[PDB]
Design a protein around this ligand. Structure first.
Ligand SMILES: [Ca+2]
Ligand SMILES: [Ca+2]
Ligand SMILES: [Ca+2]
Ligand SMILES: [Ca+2]
Ligand SMILES: [Ca+2]
Ligand SMILES: [Ca+2]
Lengths: 175, 87, 177, 176, 175, 177, 176, 87, 87, 87, 87, 87
């Protein structure tokens, strides 16, 4: 039982823990995600515990239930503004999407080849890092991250397929 | 960077203080946390802080990591005093 | 007596919302997105307002700018022509003001909705909300939810007031540790 | 002949729109949003174009990059696989170019649709539009309305021309 | 103060009282209308009173607040399933859309020329009658009725414009 | 032991929902609309189910019918191919059964959700809801809200139970007239 | 030459779809829903068609009916005025015909996309699809997916042909 | 077609009775209403009926208009009796 | 099955006329066409009718195909004379 | 009420022989299924049938329940002969 | 800090002369408005300007407030000369 | 500004190589192109690079235009040799 900083949203049936320094816009991004049909589990403070050898579960402290704090507007209740479809009691965490402010110095997976992971009580949760830069609609990206994540698990890995075709292309180009 | 306070605010760390408190933390690069009974949160943010329901007679711990951690500590210590929250 | 204010008047969820901010913040572009989301445009850039009651302001666009939006890069667009009658409205009473201020390390914001910020317009102290313009912020979504929350509070659902109430019970109950 | 251009060719409202801009500006990501809005992806990053005739230019993606988008952070994604056939198209004639220019306190952008800047592609002058990349700007919405407005003007609805015409009358009237 | 049978929905800022024999699908149609972004005022029982010489106001009895009864599912709470955006306390009634089961014998306005009206406490409320027939998405039609109604009041009457052009066409065709 | 049921398994809002009804009622067509609304298709026409617990049924489509829908008039369509991975799911536990029965003057329906209708599947008595197929009924919307309401009731929000409770207070308070 | 046909020509996903069926079946209303879904209206009720060449047929509305839809109950509505330029299109080549046939316990409809029925329009064989009008059928969704599937098949994705191919393998395998 | 009853159901016209009551009304072509203290509703439907909170000792009036109005009346009268609702 | 008429009505076949014509033709199973200067439309429907722009002195041809072909043309002819539209 | 058969169809029961079968079953009110290798499907529908992959030398069982039980069965038997599917 | 002028532009202040004016005002941090016949608009923006319909013989007033108050004004004055708009 | 290389790496310029190449070119302001058999792409980006399908024994040309043209090519050349990609 430990508290993690971030926003737990259930996107397309997957638990996704959005992380990043305060100010990056995790709540605001989540707010957009519930409007797109996804569900909010916990905002800011995410209480997680290890359900087992391969499963972490996250939920919000009763006091923060259904709540989002948005700089400028203040506290909003998504259950009250969007109905039961916007909230969920809890979920197992399947993916972590870290929002890291963009700096000319840092790099990011340009190939899904990334094999990053973050430990949460002995459990290695896959982790994805996307850059926060102007003209970036974070919601769309986090959302497609879940989508792609789910697609890869269904047996559709665009990255692996492409690399396979690229070698074929090179073996050939060699004439 | 670590300083343990004893909350003396008669009304605990509620909305108003939690606010001024995290705004001070926000002013520094270092990362600043707040622990209260095992549970520890990010002091730069806030729902978390308020979610701890820190009452009078509570023992909290503020910590930071960064180039300006010890400055962050002082400003927080000053706000704690300034806002008659704790010692 | 009609005065001309700088900003963009939009009818969101039935509420007249005046979007203000320095020229360049992106008011037009944000409004353009708002009409696509189903909200209505009243006035862009120049908003002619006049007082109706001791507690009511009405805004409308000068005939010449009717149905128009100026978007840096594209130029002038007619939302009535590109989206139909559903995208425009002749006028509306101003109920809320959302000011876009470009985010800077020094500035502070309403982390809580306890704010009672206000702004005068012919004696009428219209409610005002200030949101920061920062990267990764979809301004349309936020302004929109501001109207939504505003309307919700008036229907008797104030998340802020409810939370503070619960925070106190929690704090009370907690000093028994 | 066939040249490779840098950008993203998307089919917006039946129009071929070539989104150009320095790498890092967000072309792919914007395009990704555009397919979710119901538009079609033709080519990402590398756009192979050739001249079909004195006025037509056609773009398509190299077989190897077919249906693909590379998104910083996520990596390579297949839009056909994630969104279905409705998200992709084999090719299209290029009708408009929307260049995403990083906004600077100096750079200029036409605050009027009057600006008729154009760009040559194999001796074919393709109309070009330049929008600034600035915070709080949802690029997808803007590129999309650019196509919309472009199509509207060709159907005989030029808001800019209409406004200037009325602006003039107003001024004449103002001469009390 | 009188109770009328029907469903009061606020569509595009307009109060629209949907009427028709039980069984026609007024609640189900309204349910779809709230999902499309419109607001529910009253279901089944609509309590109306005359606000003045030219205004009728409708609202639901406290007991039926936020409620919809859907044959098969039972009672559902739209505020609870869709949030505050789905409900509204009350509204002035601007248009009546009567759903009349389709029969080979009846006719309906094929020209917006219709000038039908229904009295509600001395006030003449414009009335529109659409036929309930297979392959008819009632929600879309009621919705566009409000849309068109609002458009006509803004000075855009397609019917009047067309008739004007048709006479021109005939005066001309006469060679 | 896998038995094959007739109907359409769809994952709506996270709930596995088996749509049943006589051939011709329009199950496929309704499901097609449901995937466009963002829900997922598991099995069309033939649903292979097996028991997992004393209280759980799992459904899936025979490999040969994977991702497929047969729509009278159009023929066979592949939703994965026309809508992407988001439109399909390998399988799901069946939580609710929505039976489409063609409406007739003689039949009666659950005007109230107090219904405790159920249907057996390998000892597991899955909840069942029956909606009438009548003109002017958008079946997709209704099935969808059935899942929504089902999920809402399980989260502790039972509009039916709440209403009955309020009706009694009203009736009590009323016999003082 | 130019003949007037009865139906509604809508532009669905870039395709010209001529919706035909007996008056009363709901052609306009369906079309009205289709424009709200993002498709374009070309002609309502009266569709003026002419042959552009050995394989192309073009439809358009008589000036007088431009942008108009007649909906039983509401009357005449202008989709350009209620939805903007995005809802209308001047004309289009007709690629598919979706005929709305009133469902009867006898009438047949291909439960397979194999059915390759066609229809002649000025010596041009236009592919035709027949869907039944029955309760609980959202006609818009179906006509729309008909265009979608039509477009998908032309891009090389024929679910019907693929299924029959697999059905055969299954049967071969079943011959233990 | 009009018959006034005196509700004798100890629990008033709640969910269950309101139900059986409107199902009976539904079986007839004639239109059937129900009045209780000025307020009158459509007996074929139901939220309305239940929304009247008809209690024990209540005086309600059922009415109908149609080719089979008097049949509708009888069936309703029979259900009222059958369901021990009123006289 | 046919019947050619000469439009007499000064008003021409505008909205009202067309409404009554199409309204009549609709009551029949047979198909019903209307031809004016080559242009042929569905007399059941109407924008089609109104679009022809049939003026006074026009020669139109109504035709029907179906079981009730004749009933349809008799009914229509009756309307032409009934509403003083033509002959 | 049922009947067993042995598919002789050199190409098993694919699309063509499937549609015909379900089209014959779809003319009766009775419920008619088709059993093959254990799995049973609704014969009025069809992805269901084809999904079975009934090949040559297969033993299938058709069954029905309703007023026209024997009727449906007698027509299905005749259909197995017309299209030479088996007996 | 302001300055008045008399438009001499034979074609008033339309699109061209408007953009130039607002482009000049948009190079300063100060706030600069334009007053004409009572109504005042933000000079950094522009649908605002054009909306005024400033014609030949018009008397307009430009004003600014900030660090570069006089600067912005001095540049706007020079712009009124370069483009021959007035003085 | 240019520098032609001969690709030596057996592996060819697949994902990893391209990642390090493009990653390098990106650190610079100047533009950076890559040509292989006429095909020229943006070396900052990458699908473009990976698409060329550059194999061992390939002759590619890197070019830059901008303030740091030279720094860019020196950095790139260094990577070609650093990752044993070419020379
Ligand atoms: Ca926050
Ligand atoms: Ca602007
Ligand atoms: Ca990219
Ligand atoms: Ca109902
Ligand atoms: Ca089917
Ligand atoms: Ca029509």
């Amino acid at each position: 039982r430990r508290s993690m900083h971030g926003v737990l949203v259930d996107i397309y049936g997957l638990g996704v823990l959005i992380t990043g320094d305060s100010g990056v816009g995790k709540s605001e991004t989540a707010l957009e995600l519930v409007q797109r049909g996804h569900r909010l589990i916990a905002d800011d403070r995410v209480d997680v515990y290890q359900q087992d050898e391969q499963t972490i579960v996250g939920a919000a402290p009763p006091i923060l239930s259904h709540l989002l704090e948005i700089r400028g507007l203040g506290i909003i209740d998504v259950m009250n503004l969007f109905g039961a479809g916007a909230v969920r009691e809890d979920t197992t965490i399947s993916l972590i999407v870290h929002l890291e402010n963009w700096t000319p110095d840092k790099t990011f997976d340009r190939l899904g080849s990334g094999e990053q992971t973050q430990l949460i009580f002995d459990v290695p949760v896959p982790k994805i890092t996307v850059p926060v830069k102007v003209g970036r609609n974070l919601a769309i990206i986090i959302e497609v991250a879940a989508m792609n994540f789910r697609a890869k698990s269904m047996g559709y890995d665009a990255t692996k397929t492409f690399e396979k075709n690229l070698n074929h292309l090179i073996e050939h180009n060699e004439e | 960077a670590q300083k343990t306070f004893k909350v003396t605010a008669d009304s605990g760390i509620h909305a108003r203080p939690a606010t001024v408190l995290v705004q001070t933390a926000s002013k520094y690069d270092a990362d600043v946390n707040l622990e209260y009974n095992g549970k520890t949160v990010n002091l730069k943010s806030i729902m978390g802080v308020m979610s701890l329901g820190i009452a009078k007679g509570a023992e909290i711990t503020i910590s930071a990591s960064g180039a300006d951690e010890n400055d962050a500590l002082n400003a927080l210590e000053e706000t704690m005093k300034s806002e008659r929250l704790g010692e």
